[PDB]
Amino acid sequence: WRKWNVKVNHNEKRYATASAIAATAVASLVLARGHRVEKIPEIPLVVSTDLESIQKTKEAVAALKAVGAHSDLLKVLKSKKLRAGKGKYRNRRWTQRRGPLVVYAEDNGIVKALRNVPGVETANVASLNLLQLAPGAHLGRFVIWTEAAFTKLDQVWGSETVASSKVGYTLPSHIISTSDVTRIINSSEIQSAIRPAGQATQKRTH
Amino acid sequence: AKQSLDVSSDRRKARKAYFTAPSSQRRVLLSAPLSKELRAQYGIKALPIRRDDEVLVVRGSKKGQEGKISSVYRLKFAVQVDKVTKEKVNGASVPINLHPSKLVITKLHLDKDRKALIQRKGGKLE
Amino acid sequence: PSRFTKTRKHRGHVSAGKGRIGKHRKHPGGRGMAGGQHHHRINMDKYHPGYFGKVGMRYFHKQQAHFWKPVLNLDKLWTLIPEDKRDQYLKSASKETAPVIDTLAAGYGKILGKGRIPNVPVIVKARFVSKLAEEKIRAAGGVVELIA
Amino acid sequence: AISKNLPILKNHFRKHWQERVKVHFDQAGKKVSRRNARATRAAKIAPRPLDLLRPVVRAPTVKYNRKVRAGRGFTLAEVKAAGLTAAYARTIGIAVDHRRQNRNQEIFDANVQRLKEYQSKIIVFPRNGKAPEAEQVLSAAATFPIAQPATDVEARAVQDNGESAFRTLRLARSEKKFRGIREKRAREKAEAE
RNA sequence: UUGACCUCAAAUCAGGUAGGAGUACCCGCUGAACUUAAGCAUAUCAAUAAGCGGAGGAAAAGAAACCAACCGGGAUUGCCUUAGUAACGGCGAGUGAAGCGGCAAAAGCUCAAAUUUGAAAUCUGGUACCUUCGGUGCCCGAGUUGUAAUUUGGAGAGGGCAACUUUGGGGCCGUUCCUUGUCUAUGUUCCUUGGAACAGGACGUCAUAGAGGGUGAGAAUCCCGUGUGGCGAGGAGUGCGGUUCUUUGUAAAGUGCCUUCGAAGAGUCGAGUUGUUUGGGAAUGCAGCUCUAAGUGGGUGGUAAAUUCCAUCUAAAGCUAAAUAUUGGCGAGAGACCGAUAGCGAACAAGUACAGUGAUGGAAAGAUGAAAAGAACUUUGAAAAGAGAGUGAAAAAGUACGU
RNA sequence: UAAUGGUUAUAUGCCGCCCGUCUUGAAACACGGACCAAGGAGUCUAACGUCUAUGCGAGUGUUUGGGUGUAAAACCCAUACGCGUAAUGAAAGUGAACGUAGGUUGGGGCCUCGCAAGAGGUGCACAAUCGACCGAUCCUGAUGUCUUCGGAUGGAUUUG
RNA sequence: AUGCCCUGACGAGUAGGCAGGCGUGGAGGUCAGUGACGAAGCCUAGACCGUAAGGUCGGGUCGAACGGCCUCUAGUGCAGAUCUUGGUGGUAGUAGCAAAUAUUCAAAUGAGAACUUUGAAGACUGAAGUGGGGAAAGGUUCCACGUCAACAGCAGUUGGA
Ligand SMILES: [Mg+2]
Ligand SMILES: [Mg+2]
Ligand SMILES: [Mg+2]
Ligand SMILES: [Mg+2]
Ligand SMILES: [Mg+2]
Ligand SMILES: [Mg+2]
Ligand SMILES: [Mg+2]
Ligand SMILES: [Mg+2]
Ligand SMILES: [Mg+2]
Ligand SMILES: [Mg+2]
Ligand SMILES: [Mg+2]
Ligand SMILES: [Mg+2]
Ligand SMILES: [Mg+2]
Ligand SMILES: [Mg+2]
Ligand SMILES: [Mg+2]
Ligand SMILES: [Mg+2]
Ligand SMILES: [Mg+2]
Ligand SMILES: [Mg+2]
Ligand SMILES: [Mg+2]
Ligand SMILES: [Mg+2]
Ligand SMILES: [Mg+2]
Ligand SMILES: [Mg+2]
Ligand SMILES: [Mg+2]
Ligand SMILES: [Mg+2]
Ligand SMILES: [Mg+2]
Ligand SMILES: [Mg+2]
Ligand SMILES: [Mg+2]
Ligand SMILES: [Mg+2]
Ligand SMILES: [Mg+2]
Ligand SMILES: [Mg+2]
Ligand SMILES: [Mg+2]
Ligand SMILES: [Mg+2]
Ligand SMILES: [Mg+2]
Ligand SMILES: [Mg+2]
Ligand SMILES: [Mg+2]
Ligand SMILES: [Mg+2]
Ligand SMILES: [Mg+2]
Ligand SMILES: [Mg+2]
Ligand SMILES: [Mg+2]
Ligand SMILES: [Mg+2]
Ligand SMILES: [Mg+2]
Ligand SMILES: [Mg+2]
Ligand SMILES: [Mg+2]
Ligand SMILES: [Mg+2]
Ligand SMILES: [Mg+2]
Ligand SMILES: [Mg+2]
Ligand SMILES: [Mg+2]
Ligand SMILES: [Mg+2]
Ligand SMILES: [Mg+2]
Ligand SMILES: [Mg+2]
Ligand SMILES: [Mg+2]
Ligand SMILES: [Mg+2]
Ligand SMILES: [Mg+2]
Ligand SMILES: [Mg+2]
Ligand SMILES: [Mg+2]
Ligand SMILES: [Mg+2]
Ligand SMILES: [Mg+2]
Ligand SMILES: [Mg+2]
Ligand SMILES: [Mg+2]
Ligand SMILES: [Mg+2]
Ligand SMILES: [Mg+2]
Ligand SMILES: [Mg+2]
Ligand SMILES: [Mg+2]
Ligand SMILES: [Mg+2]
Ligand SMILES: [Mg+2]
Ligand SMILES: [Mg+2]
Ligand SMILES: [Mg+2]
Ligand SMILES: [Mg+2]
Ligand SMILES: [Mg+2]
Ligand SMILES: [Mg+2]
Ligand SMILES: [Mg+2]
Ligand SMILES: [Mg+2]
Ligand SMILES: [Mg+2]
Ligand SMILES: [Mg+2]
Ligand SMILES: [Mg+2]
Ligand SMILES: [Mg+2]
Ligand SMILES: [Mg+2]
Ligand SMILES: [Mg+2]
Ligand SMILES: [Mg+2]
Ligand SMILES: [Mg+2]
Ligand SMILES: [Mg+2]
Ligand SMILES: [Mg+2]
Ligand SMILES: [Mg+2]
Ligand SMILES: [Mg+2]
Ligand SMILES: [Mg+2]
Ligand SMILES: [Mg+2]
Ligand SMILES: [Mg+2]
Ligand SMILES: [Mg+2]
Ligand SMILES: [Mg+2]
Ligand SMILES: [Mg+2]
Ligand SMILES: [Mg+2]
Ligand SMILES: [Mg+2]
Ligand SMILES: [Mg+2]
Ligand SMILES: [Mg+2]
Ligand SMILES: [Mg+2]
Ligand SMILES: [Mg+2]
Ligand SMILES: [Mg+2]
Ligand SMILES: [Mg+2]
Ligand SMILES: [Mg+2]
Ligand SMILES: [Mg+2]
Ligand SMILES: [Mg+2]
Ligand SMILES: [Mg+2]
Ligand SMILES: [Mg+2]
Ligand SMILES: [Mg+2]
Ligand SMILES: [Mg+2]
Ligand SMILES: [Mg+2]
Ligand SMILES: [Mg+2]
Ligand SMILES: [Mg+2]
Ligand SMILES: [Mg+2]
Ligand SMILES: [Mg+2]
Ligand SMILES: [Mg+2]
Ligand SMILES: [Mg+2]
Ligand SMILES: [Mg+2]
Ligand SMILES: [Mg+2]
Ligand SMILES: [Mg+2]
Ligand SMILES: [Mg+2]
Ligand SMILES: [Mg+2]
Ligand SMILES: [Mg+2]
Ligand SMILES: [Mg+2]
Ligand SMILES: [Mg+2]
Ligand SMILES: [Mg+2]
Ligand SMILES: [Mg+2]
Ligand SMILES: [Mg+2]
Ligand SMILES: [Mg+2]
Ligand SMILES: [Mg+2]
Ligand SMILES: [Mg+2]
Ligand SMILES: [Mg+2]
Ligand SMILES: [Mg+2]
Ligand SMILES: [Mg+2]
Ligand SMILES: [Mg+2]
Ligand SMILES: [Mg+2]
Ligand SMILES: [Mg+2]
Ligand SMILES: [Mg+2]
Ligand SMILES: [Mg+2]
Ligand SMILES: [Mg+2]
Ligand SMILES: [Mg+2]
Ligand SMILES: [Mg+2]
Ligand SMILES: [Mg+2]
Ligand SMILES: [Mg+2]
Ligand SMILES: [Mg+2]
Ligand SMILES: [Mg+2]
Ligand SMILES: [Mg+2]
Ligand SMILES: [Mg+2]
Ligand SMILES: [Mg+2]
Ligand SMILES: [Mg+2]
Ligand SMILES: [Mg+2]
Ligand SMILES: [Mg+2]
Ligand SMILES: [Mg+2]
Ligand SMILES: [Mg+2]
Ligand SMILES: [Mg+2]
Ligand SMILES: [Mg+2]
Ligand SMILES: [Mg+2]
Ligand SMILES: [Mg+2]
Ligand SMILES: [Mg+2]
Ligand SMILES: [Mg+2]
Ligand SMILES: [Mg+2]
Structure with missing residues (x-):
């Protein structure tokens, strides 16, 4: 009768999920988290909906290598x-890195085709x-979207013109309008309003 | 990955099921692959191993040696092949225990049950 | 969070934060609410005044649905009209078409007069109302309808 | 002991309560098995819809008499007014309650209408014939839902006669409070001369 | 004399049944104390532990002598809540429900009961033949001190008449399911290290299979398996594609009016007293003793009583699946569990060795090596053994063996 | 480069009583401690106070259940229910704006004039105080009454 | 930019509070981390860093796994408890092995004889026996052959081993 599961508020779960999805955007978090995506042109990586109908593992890994997940797919199975430890004889014998998350809107073979590939996880x-989007509570999973998945994301989480399709839900607000404060500080309205600065290391008088 | 709730990924259970296997289970467990010539001839890849089979060792320190399996020692999970011996210093000659997965069958002992076994596994029997 | 506890910080220190003199024991003042009239009397009166003794008359077999009468105040009362209709009902206020608010259908048993409905006529269906709720509802030009 | 300004607690653990601790670790497993039982029962009672038709009844207890809900069974009188018998209604998916009675015409008409809608929307298979399959819908409750009856429109004319309607509650409370003592006063006036 | 009847016996008479084990959960009886109250006696622990009786895969409960007071719900059980609340309590410590509402599951019924009275229409047994979990015939028996048919309060029965609707069973293969067998992919290619490649590097292949385990060191690809399907085999009161007993048959069951009825459980309900129990308070339930009902009346409607109503059920007889429980048994699958002073007492010939008269108590004890290859042979010594030699990658692994 | 330095052993000078514990007081002629290894003691739960963090906010709580699933995860969800939005009284009951939701005294910040110092204005939170309103208590007792009900209005060194 | 820099003051502490850190078992993530060309462990009056908890390296031994960082979690840190289990000391080659009168010579056997066997001598129990049998209890101890690692508190070639 120890507490084993922990209740989280549903809206806070949705907050964390939405911030994880937003962190699967710009590539600094994806590089810092792991994820060899330095030779990927643009994040989010959205592929065509024909991926969801691929039902051979060979064709699925050809598609992932062709759209650019080759070095991540090689980071897994070389890791x-x-x-280490007593976990290796508690049915936890091998450890490996996390591969890409392949996110789809409808499943026509892609789950079973990517089932056997190490590291690669699929998701609706x-x-x-x-747990898939921020594993180890580190933001920025490498995610390959299909086009249908990317389109359906606007209906699953809402926008300024689509509500949410979750009951009562809105995406969270911002308490600050920009995330980089250096251009607010070097804006002309603050810079013309502030006094001049000093030496940034004071002279040692006396 | 396992898909059925009947088989076990438990390492302890798998090792008890290996080390406490009866001899009729150890016969299947002590399988041995065929050679390139016999795999082309019989269309199948591996068979349970027999006494009068001719084998080539392809691993370990006696690799590349030939012989007939003098004994299938299922209690030790081993096969004793003649011409593959240890010369002791008193002049005695003891058989070296080999595992059949490190062997290659180069000639089968065929009888009616082995022929039916090959045909059951889909073999050409040629 | 076992690693954040002060048990981890009292390791090496003899008494585990409990003192060498007073010397942590099993139950030094008794168990539970023991001695609330003898040695815990000051913690009773000072912080639980009224704790001991009897108060008024017993009710055998009380059912707390003879007493379900949730109270609505007039300061809210237009929350019960949905927001798309609220604007059109308070703009160009009208008798001969006033909103009907069933208060029971929203789950209150009494209307009370906290303050200042706007001057729009309203038909309020209530199980119970107070006098000032009646006065302010009629001063807006509306009516209370008694329902059961 | 008793110490600082804290609420006085009433934790009842002076029995051997640890002999009787049930932790519901099997919540997900019992959910899997309830869904398995529903699927197995559905396959056993192919095309029949896995639950009986229940009537709409008014809930008791004035806290809850503003709501209607699903009751147990239809009322022999409701079954007869729908045009069938109870022993045959129990075989075509209608729950029948012999022990409830109708004193509300609106509830009665709602349940006779519910029964006639059901009898129009079911296909009773022939008893010995070929009986072509009619695509199992798994729930009668989600295809004949319990609807809360509309009691008023959204807007009407203000009809204020100046009765003042708090005075109505005060006067009606006072007549109940003094009905017996002044009925007895009236009869002792009648016992004069 | 003889023939019954009733009651009681006997038999190694014919056939059958009970005991004991297990006992985690279940239905009962019986029943403490430590403890808390900072002492203690009521209280609490606890309607618990121990003791005893009885079941099953669930048990019990269960189709209202219910809850209510509403616009009323509607068998039982369980969860969420009600609620640490109403209430009880040296009104102290403490204790403590229930109705409603939301769910899970849902299923309803059977007797006493009536004159068959123009059919004892009923049933056990024996015997004979078969379609052998049974049927049919015959005979003896049970039984009128009442076995069948009809009826169960929701009703219903008798009679009188416009009236239409519905006929039940038995064997085969696949199929619901259970048990179980079998088949089903891809490198053992090169080089380096090593005793051993399963390591490292290079070139590949399969992947609905990169779970797991073995194999001389981290093996998807060597082996078993795994994944996906196919082919069987042996069984389970059948949802259906065919089969057939076809004067199964003025059967049986429903449904409309009218009329006369409408039997409904006794030393029981209830009452007093005593004791126990309960949250149950001028008595919640149970039990002993005493008193002992009625028939538009009996119970209940949470403050004792008289009077007037009202509301709600219909006890003193009985059956019933599911949702619920389950430190035992059988079979599985898992783990942010423990890792040989831990984890069960027990990883091992562990409830063992051993102690006690006895009830009972109750340990310690895993690891050579990849393979015994477990040290031929020489020499010293009476021998143990030593020194050499030798095996082994290692003897800084020599059975007194990993480190 | 051990030449200076570090480490270590030793010598020399001065200093240095045995730790833990209870205690006013321990080196104590107080108690435990021969030694070494391994084990060995504020935990988990139900309910709760303060504070803090997070989500939403007059609301909130998806996880009892249902749907769904790559399956004890994750994802989705209705009706309820709990707590909050109303107090007070033993209870029957009643039930919160005279006013710009009041006056006064402070009050950060802001606004106006000022080169400042200041002067004025507005003053959220909060503190003090006097009022107003709701309930309980004690009074007063209007219009009506099928005459004993009702309880308007006005009060109070009372009380929540 | 819980960064860097400037200026000033301050620093005793039981019981206790709070903070910032060090370490251990296990979990999620990462370093495509280390490793049979040697992981872990262990030893080391050798070295380096940290005020310290500790961390790192070199050499020896060893043979299969294990680390850093970011988080999660706890059966998480020992000098004590007349603590528990196991092992080992000093005392210490010490106290002792002194009741029941008592042994001795030869030969044989044997590697080895105070103690075995046989001969010889000397003694004792002294028929309410240190004799001959049984009851309870034991359970093969009886007897023969082989044999001495342990046991017979010296020895042993002997033995109820
Ligand atoms: Mg939420
Ligand atoms: Mg493929
Ligand atoms: Mg581990
Ligand atoms: Mg380990
Ligand atoms: Mg380890
Ligand atoms: Mg395990
Ligand atoms: Mg495993
Ligand atoms: Mg494993
Ligand atoms: Mg890991
Ligand atoms: Mg926010
Ligand atoms: Mg064969
Ligand atoms: Mg923290
Ligand atoms: Mg200490
Ligand atoms: Mg410390
Ligand atoms: Mg301290
Ligand atoms: Mg403290
Ligand atoms: Mg102490
Ligand atoms: Mg104290
Ligand atoms: Mg204390
Ligand atoms: Mg006193
Ligand atoms: Mg009290
Ligand atoms: Mg009182
Ligand atoms: Mg009272
Ligand atoms: Mg009022
Ligand atoms: Mg205090
Ligand atoms: Mg689920
Ligand atoms: Mg289950
Ligand atoms: Mg169902
Ligand atoms: Mg009604
Ligand atoms: Mg007999
Ligand atoms: Mg028995
Ligand atoms: Mg039990
Ligand atoms: Mg019971
Ligand atoms: Mg106790
Ligand atoms: Mg107590
Ligand atoms: Mg006491
Ligand atoms: Mg005490
Ligand atoms: Mg006391
Ligand atoms: Mg005492
Ligand atoms: Mg009790
Ligand atoms: Mg108990
Ligand atoms: Mg018992
Ligand atoms: Mg007893
Ligand atoms: Mg049984
Ligand atoms: Mg069951
Ligand atoms: Mg039963
Ligand atoms: Mg029963
Ligand atoms: Mg009844
Ligand atoms: Mg009710
Ligand atoms: Mg009723
Ligand atoms: Mg009920
Ligand atoms: Mg419950
Ligand atoms: Mg509730
Ligand atoms: Mg509550
Ligand atoms: Mg009790
Ligand atoms: Mg309910
Ligand atoms: Mg009945
Ligand atoms: Mg090789
Ligand atoms: Mg290697
Ligand atoms: Mg090279
Ligand atoms: Mg091998
Ligand atoms: Mg590894
Ligand atoms: Mg392997
Ligand atoms: Mg495989
Ligand atoms: Mg595999
Ligand atoms: Mg499979
Ligand atoms: Mg009939
Ligand atoms: Mg009756
Ligand atoms: Mg009687
Ligand atoms: Mg009686
Ligand atoms: Mg009793
Ligand atoms: Mg009691
Ligand atoms: Mg009583
Ligand atoms: Mg009594
Ligand atoms: Mg009463
Ligand atoms: Mg585990
Ligand atoms: Mg160990
Ligand atoms: Mg053990
Ligand atoms: Mg043990
Ligand atoms: Mg054992
Ligand atoms: Mg004894
Ligand atoms: Mg004994
Ligand atoms: Mg060892
Ligand atoms: Mg090896
Ligand atoms: Mg030597
Ligand atoms: Mg060698
Ligand atoms: Mg070695
Ligand atoms: Mg060597
Ligand atoms: Mg050697
Ligand atoms: Mg070694
Ligand atoms: Mg020099
Ligand atoms: Mg030098
Ligand atoms: Mg010196
Ligand atoms: Mg000196
Ligand atoms: Mg000195
Ligand atoms: Mg000196
Ligand atoms: Mg001097
Ligand atoms: Mg000195
Ligand atoms: Mg002490
Ligand atoms: Mg003293
Ligand atoms: Mg002194
Ligand atoms: Mg001291
Ligand atoms: Mg002294
Ligand atoms: Mg002393
Ligand atoms: Mg002492
Ligand atoms: Mg010491
Ligand atoms: Mg001592
Ligand atoms: Mg130790
Ligand atoms: Mg330790
Ligand atoms: Mg301890
Ligand atoms: Mg909720
Ligand atoms: Mg969810
Ligand atoms: Mg009230
Ligand atoms: Mg009053
Ligand atoms: Mg005002
Ligand atoms: Mg006023
Ligand atoms: Mg102010
Ligand atoms: Mg007032
Ligand atoms: Mg109030
Ligand atoms: Mg007042
Ligand atoms: Mg100073
Ligand atoms: Mg200091
Ligand atoms: Mg520090
Ligand atoms: Mg642990
Ligand atoms: Mg760790
Ligand atoms: Mg984990
Ligand atoms: Mg090597
Ligand atoms: Mg090493
Ligand atoms: Mg080691
Ligand atoms: Mg040292
Ligand atoms: Mg060294
Ligand atoms: Mg080794
Ligand atoms: Mg090894
Ligand atoms: Mg390492
Ligand atoms: Mg531990
Ligand atoms: Mg510990
Ligand atoms: Mg210490
Ligand atoms: Mg200490
Ligand atoms: Mg110690
Ligand atoms: Mg000690
Ligand atoms: Mg010990
Ligand atoms: Mg020792
Ligand atoms: Mg000596
Ligand atoms: Mg001596
Ligand atoms: Mg002596
Ligand atoms: Mg002597
Ligand atoms: Mg001699
Ligand atoms: Mg001598
Ligand atoms: Mg002589
Ligand atoms: Mg003499
Ligand atoms: Mg003898
Ligand atoms: Mg001998
Ligand atoms: Mg001796
Ligand atoms: Mg000796
Ligand atoms: Mg001797
Ligand atoms: Mg002997």
């Missing part, structure tokens, strides 16, 4: 290690597990 846009 397979025997687990209807769900989007936070």
